[PDB]
Amino acid sequence: NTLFDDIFQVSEVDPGRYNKVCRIEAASTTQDQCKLTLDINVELFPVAAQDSLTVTIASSLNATRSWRPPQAGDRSLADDYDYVMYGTAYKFEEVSKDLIAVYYSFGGLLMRLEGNYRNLNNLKQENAYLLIRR
Amino acid sequence: PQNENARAEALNLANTDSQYLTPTSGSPVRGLIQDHISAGVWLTSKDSFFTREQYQQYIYGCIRPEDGHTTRSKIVTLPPTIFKPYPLWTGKQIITTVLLNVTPPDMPGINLISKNKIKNEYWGKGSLENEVLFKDGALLCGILDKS
Amino acid sequence: KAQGRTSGKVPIPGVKQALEKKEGLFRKHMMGKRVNYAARSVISPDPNI
Amino acid sequence: EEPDREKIKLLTQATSEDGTSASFQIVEEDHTLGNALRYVIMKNPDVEFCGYSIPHPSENLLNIRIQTYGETTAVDALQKGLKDLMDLCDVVESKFTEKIKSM
Numbered sequence: 001n002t003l004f005d006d007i008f009q010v011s012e013v014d015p016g017r018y019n020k021v022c023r024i025e026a027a028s029t030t031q032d033q034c035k036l037t038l039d040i041n042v043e044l045f046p047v048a049a050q051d052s053l054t055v056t057i058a059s060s061l062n063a064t065r066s067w068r069p070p071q072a073g074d075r076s077l078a079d080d081y082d083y084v085m086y087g088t089a090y091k092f093e094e095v096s097k098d099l100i101a102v103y104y105s106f107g108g109l110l111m112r113l114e115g116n117y118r119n120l121n122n123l124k125q126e127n128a129y130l131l132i133r134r
Numbered sequence: 135p136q137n138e139n140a141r142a143e144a145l146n147l148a149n150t151d152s153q154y155l156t157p158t159s160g161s162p163v164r165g166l167i168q169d170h171i172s173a174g175v176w177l178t179s180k181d182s183f184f185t186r187e188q189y190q191q192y193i194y195g196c197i198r199p200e201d202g203h204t205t206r207s208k209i210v211t212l213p214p215t216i217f218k219p220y221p222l223w224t225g226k227q228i229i230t231t232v233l234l235n236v237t238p239p240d241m242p243g244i245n246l247i248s249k250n251k252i253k254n255e256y257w258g259k260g261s262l263e264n265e266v267l268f269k270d271g272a273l274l275c276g277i278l279d280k281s
Numbered sequence: 282k283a284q285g286r287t288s289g290k291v292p293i294p295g296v297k298q299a300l301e302k303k304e305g306l307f308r309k310h311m312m313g314k315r316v317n318y319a320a321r322s323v324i325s326p327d328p329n330i
Numbered sequence: 331e332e333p334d335r336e337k338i339k340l341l342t343q344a345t346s347e348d349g350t351s352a353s354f355q356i357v358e359e360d361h362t363l364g365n366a367l368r369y370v371i372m373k374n375p376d377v378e379f380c381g382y383s384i385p386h387p388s389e390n391l392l393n394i395r396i397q398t399y400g401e402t403t404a405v406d407a408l409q410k411g412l413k414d415l416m417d418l419c420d421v422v423e424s425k426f427t428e429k430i431k432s433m
Binding site: 135 | 318328
């Protein structure tokens with residue numbers, strides 16, 4: 001089930017001493033209080049400045065138990081996207097009033113969401129799939 | 135030593151496991167040295183990605199259930215941190231797996247908030263790789279050093 | 282104690298000098314000894330043990 | 331006759347009760363067989379875990395470990411990867427025989 005979905009306009013793609021990992025900074029196009037900061041594997045999914053990405057955070061993908069490599073005859077929520085990661089939320093913060101930030105870590109690849117309407121259904125769960133279309 | 139009394143004391147009292155901290159001021163004296171210090175900065179780096187065939191070779195190459203390194207009589211793995219285009223594990227996620235197999239299953243994970251020796255400007259702009267974070271036995275942030 | 286010949290290098294150290302030195306009897310054969318069932322060798326590194 | 335009974339050796343202290351998670355010990359081997367056999371076992375769609383290990387370099391012992399998802403043992407997965415390692419060396423031998431004829 002989708003816990004967050006928006007569309008983010010990329011402002012800066014910073015390689016920064018890495019050959020496969022870039023830092024993305026993207027404010028959204030629908031709400032004005034919310035920003036993104038993401039570490040993507042730029043070899044698999046190359047992101048430039050002034051892109052129009054589509055970030056979605058789900059809690060699962062649709063009766064699974066543990067990971068198993070994909071086979072034929074499956075269908076996932078990841079089929080609709082281009083770059084799916086997986087990681088844990090570890091820190092909640094309110095930056096000021098009317099803003100609450102969450103921090104994700106996709107095995108060391110970090111993400112920071114700031115905003116106001118994500119305090120509804122971003123729990124502190126040890127599993128939140130992150131999906132990017134286009 | 136040549137009897138069972140003196141064997142039970144080199145196993146329990148004078149053994150190397152109980153001499154981890156020194157009696158002078160409590161500092162630890164035992165740890166890895168040079169090529170192990172300078173590989174943790176490469177393995178637990180953020181550039182380090184591993185395919186599935188590479189990931190299980192590094193787990194079994196260090197942890198063998200035959201010699202008695204596991205605790206669950208079966209090697210357990212993690213889901214990858216990249217699913218769709220090409221499924222990949224991260225180098226910090228191998229450290230989570232080697233602590234998931236050598237620490238006992240009844241206790242919860244280790245929770246540590248520490249630092250490194252390598253400053254946050256060496257890695258780039260707005261990185262946080264000086265802060266070592268272990269949450270539920272999972273390295274989520276920061277490389278590993280001599281520290 | 283004894284002067285005797287007084288030419289130097291006095292022989293037969295006697296039963297006190299068999300006890301008093303760094304070696305003597307009481308630090309080379311009581312407080313430190315030589316042992317059976319021991320070995321020594323040059324050491325070499327290994328990361329697989 | 332006499333089949334050789336010290337080459338392959340299943341270590342029962344690491345072996346599952348179903349049979350699906352076992353660890354073998356091959357004598358007088360190294361990375362040559364072990365890295366080539368691990369590539370071929372890992373292409374089985376039923377293999378969950380596969381990796382080899384040389385315990386110490388001074389003796390010539392090779393531990394390999396196979397774990398399957400069920401519905402195939404680690405001995406049935408070892409012998410498919412021993413079959414396809416033979417049938418892969420018969421494609422390299424045939425393509426290289428033809429090109430010597432094709433010179």
